[PDB]
Amino acid sequence: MAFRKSNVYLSLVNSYIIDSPQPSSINYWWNMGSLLGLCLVIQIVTGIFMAMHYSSNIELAFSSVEHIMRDVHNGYILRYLHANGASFFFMVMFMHMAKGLYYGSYRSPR
Amino acid sequence: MAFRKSNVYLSLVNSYIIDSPQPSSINYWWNMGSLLGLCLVIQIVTGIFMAMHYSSNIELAFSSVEHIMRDVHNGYILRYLHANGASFFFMVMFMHMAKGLYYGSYRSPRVTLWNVGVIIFILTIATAFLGYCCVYGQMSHWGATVITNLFSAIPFVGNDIVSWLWGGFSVSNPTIQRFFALHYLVPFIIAAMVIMHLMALHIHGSSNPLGITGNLDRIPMHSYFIFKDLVTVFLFMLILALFVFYSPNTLGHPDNYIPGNPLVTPASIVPEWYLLPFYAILRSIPDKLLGVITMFAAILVLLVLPFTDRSVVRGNTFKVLSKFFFFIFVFNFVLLGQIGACHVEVPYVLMGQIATFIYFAYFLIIVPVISTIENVLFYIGRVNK
Amino acid sequence: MTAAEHGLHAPAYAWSHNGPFETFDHASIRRGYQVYREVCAACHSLDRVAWRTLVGVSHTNEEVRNMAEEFEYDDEPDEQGNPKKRPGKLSDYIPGPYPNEQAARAANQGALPPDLSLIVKARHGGCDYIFSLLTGYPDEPPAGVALPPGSNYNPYFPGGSIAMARVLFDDMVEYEDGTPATTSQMAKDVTTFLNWCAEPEHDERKRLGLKTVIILSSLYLLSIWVKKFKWAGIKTRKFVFNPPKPRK
Amino acid sequence: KSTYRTPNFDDVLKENNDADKGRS
Amino acid sequence: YAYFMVGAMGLLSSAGAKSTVETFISSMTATADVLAMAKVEVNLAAIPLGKNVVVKWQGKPVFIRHRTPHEIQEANSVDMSALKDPQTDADRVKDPQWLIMLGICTHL
Amino acid sequence: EVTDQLEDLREHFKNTEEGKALVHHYEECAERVKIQQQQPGYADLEHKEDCVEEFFHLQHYLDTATAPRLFDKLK
Amino acid sequence: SFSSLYKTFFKRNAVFVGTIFAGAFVFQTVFDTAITSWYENHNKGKLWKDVKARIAA
């Protein structure tokens, strides 16, 4: 029996990613939701890399953000990416909900 | 069909807490593993409520610890419980290790489990060092300096990587900032790894103390072993209370309570008690690269234990010589830690070198030859001709 | 390593508050603070604790305000921007006489004097070893040891050399009563005072610990009983193997 | 020894007073 | 043709992944102001003879020991066969009575 | 008008069999050492003896003799 | 007879939990009071309550 379905750590990823019988007529909105999840993960990663260089006081919180946006190698990309990734996350969140309302996903089965 | 086994969010919990046919002859060590899990969860909770009132700058990290000590209502309990629960967590993890090594749970059908576990081990050592740096007392600064500089033994380019991980040419704001952020991050990764640990465990149950098949009879999880966990966790709570109220500053060392000063260092700088065994072997062999590689080699020689224990009879419950050698090895381990704690002088370099030799020797060659002798004796005793 | 650079192990004094139920004898802090302020005035710091915690443990109340009216703490700037100084209150810390760090090495003729606020937590054998060090000094240094001029000897300190000018004499403090003018009294009082200032939380810590120990011991015994109870449903079982008829 | 012959539990069985109060 | 398209996608994706990983990793490197290479001066007029003077510089302590001529004689009389790293006394010194020597243990 | 309590304890236990033995040992060490320095050539002798061992032995004896009987006298 | 006690307390879980909680409340209060009193009188003159009276004159 194939190794793809034997090791549990990989059997799980098989059942959710490698092989999962999606329906034939799927439009782009399910991919919209998957994009949403991936936006979440990139947001988390860049948030961790943000917090490694962020203070936490109240007289030294604004100084921390100006420092991360101006005086660190390749930093402003991080801060704008966190902010606008959050905004896009809310855009896609609302889009995912609107799809759910429209197409009858909220009905009995789920 | 019963609602406990139907809803998915509950069908998951059923198979792991409500219905999991543990073997009949369980003793207190697997209850001790449950104790370890609860120690982890209380550590996480008190850590959240700790970081709720903890600053991060280098100039205002020690002041933050004194502030959590006194200026917060019912807060000293939080800090002492965090520290002493961490130390007790490491001791109980060591005892979990020693149990696993003794009873032969590392036999082949659980090698994935054992590897995942030792990954939790190395991760947890890293977390402890990270937090001890997060305190930034006096000797924690030197410990961070040395352990960061450890990577400079890498051939050719060694200075660039250490300077990258060390946030510059001096211990400063980025250093402690990154250390604290990573410390606050890692235990969730530990949580992910331990949910994997549980996943890998559930495939084939848990080993008997007798080292024999347990598929014959088993008794349900809940209402039997939940109380075996309750009694031991109550013991843990009371002993932790005894160490957190009446005798606070014993397990740790009374040196952290000093402001950081990168100008003077005391002549007595040692790690906390649960890092002495590896520190001893590090200071034992007289080389930089040799020691740096041999620490992770101690971890790897832990790794190599399976497909080396060539006894056809599992476990060390029926091998007098093997269990005697295991006891000589555990007393070896404690001796190694203690000699690491003591200063290095004339009668100690030889002592430590011999200690490391017998340690690694037990991992590599003692187990196979002794095991083979046990197996051949078992065959010869009960055969006529 | 030799004992000379290792320091004599601290003798195990039968201390008053070293007990499972004993509390700080803060009938003695009331004079421990007095002696500390009187003798160690311009030498050490104690710059961590705030006066809003001495009231209710050592002193009554109005005394701390009356003392705080003796120090100034550089209030917020005025309308004209000229900084001013205002008397202290119940939200201020004790000022170590040395301003930042430099006067410390300027005046002591030596190294920095550590902040006593946590000193008796950061030495092995914390509760003692400060009474030991303060009274363990000998009148004449041991014969055969040479020391830098102007320094003083102390057999209890690692290395046996300390810049402590031995100001622990008699007929000096005279607290309010007939009790001082013996060098044991001031040393003992300061020792307890410092052991308190490292954690002005001992009383309630011990009370809570007693409560927890009692509750947990009771719950331990109950749990032992219940485990013996519901486990008995399987521990007492029996098996009677009756082999089947050999038919196949 | 047929299966119906329950082994002697008299060492561990509770005394001849049933258990209508032990639940309490 | 199909495999060429797939390979082109892979090439662009690899370049992009390299760029993104480099960005994230270089985020943690030393910032700008930390690179302030400090410079210090030490007064040698009042230093004691048999004493060690330490000044913090560039994140590391630096000993300054005013070695006695007897110590100079002991140093230059050190056998060269007993040194793991052969380094003569003259090379490391500019003023014979003074040893301006870095204090960090080049061990670890 | 009261002498120091621990000082009196030290004086009292100094006049004891073991106490007198140790103090005599220490003073013999001291006189030998003084004879040693009064000899010439001590500056370049590159090795100097000391009586810190006897001093520490004596101090440890006095401490372990006076420790459990001090605070009772403390007022 | 204990049959009455069983059928009034332990037959019904709602009353059992109610009683356990009420007993917990009263126990917590009385236990705290007793422990505080014992820890107090165990140290005569060591607690500020009597020192504040002694200093007054």
Added chain:
Amino acid sequence: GPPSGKTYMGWWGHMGGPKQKGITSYAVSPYAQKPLQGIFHNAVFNSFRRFKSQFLYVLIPAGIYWYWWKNGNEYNEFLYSKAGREELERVNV
């Protein structure tokens, strides 16, 4: 569901252990017997029997390493005790 790899332990009913016949079990229920049976007799007697059975396996290693530790401590003490000019030098190198 997605079939998984072979497993050495099934669930209830298909547990996987060898089939057996003629084995008979029993029970007496927790409420019909004293929870604390033996409590002291078994405590003392079984405790001493167990401690007797495995005494040597913990006695011997502890004794060996205690002997090492005592010898090392005593030699270290002798080293730095009026012997730093006649014994310390000849063994430090």
